[PDB]
């Protein structure tokens, strides 16, 4: 369960997300990682999946993000698609939908995703030899 290939699905998706720049990767998410580190793994996954769901729900049809050019629109849709795929894997890992997130700090989506990538890669590393 804990070292399931879902971890690779998440990392693969994050690897793509972090190479993607759009009109709105600087808009913010609640920084779940600004905590002093006091939650179970499932709780961390639930919290990340929660703030990402907020983000894609709020920005999928946001006039600031939708794009003027074909390329801008494509990149927007690709980002939304990937966030939903990432989110779907996170909820699968969390096994939990109820996790309040109380952090004040907002970080850019771009910074959040790089941090979550680091945490996910660290989990993968602790699973393999």
Is 45 in contact with 88 (CB distance < 8 Å)?
A: no
How far apart CA 49 and CA 86 sit, in angstroms, is 8
Experimental technique of record: X-ray
Q: What CATH number labels 1-129?
A: 1.20.1250.10
CA angle 113, 59, 120 (to 5 degrees): 15
Question: CB-based contacts of 7: which residues, under 8 Å, 6+ apart?
Answer: 93, 120, 123, 124, 127
Can you give the residue ranges of every domain in the chain? 1-129
Is 24 in contact with 66 (CB distance < 8 Å)?
A: no
Task: Please report the resolution in angstroms.
Answer: 2.0
How far apart CA 94 and CA 47 sit, in angstroms, is 9
Strand partners, 108: 28
């Amino acid at each position: 369960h804990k070292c399931d290939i879902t971890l690779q699905e998440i990392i693969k998706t994050l690897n793509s997300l972090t190479e993607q720049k759009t009109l709105c990767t600087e808009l913010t998410v609640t920084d779940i990682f600004a905590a002093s580190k006091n939650t179970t793994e499932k709780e961390t996954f639930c919290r990340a999946a929660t703030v990402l769901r907020q983000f894609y729900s709020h920005h999928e049809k946001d006039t600031r993000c939708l794009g003027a050019t074909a390329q801008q629109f494509h990149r927007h849709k690709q980002l939304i698609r990937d966030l939903k795929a990432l989110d779907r894997n996170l909820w699968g890992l969390a096994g939990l939908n109820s996790c309040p997130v109380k952090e004040a700090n907002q970080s850019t989506l771009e910074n959040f995703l790089e941090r979550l990538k680091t945490i996910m890669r660290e989990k993968y590393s602790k699973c393999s030899s």
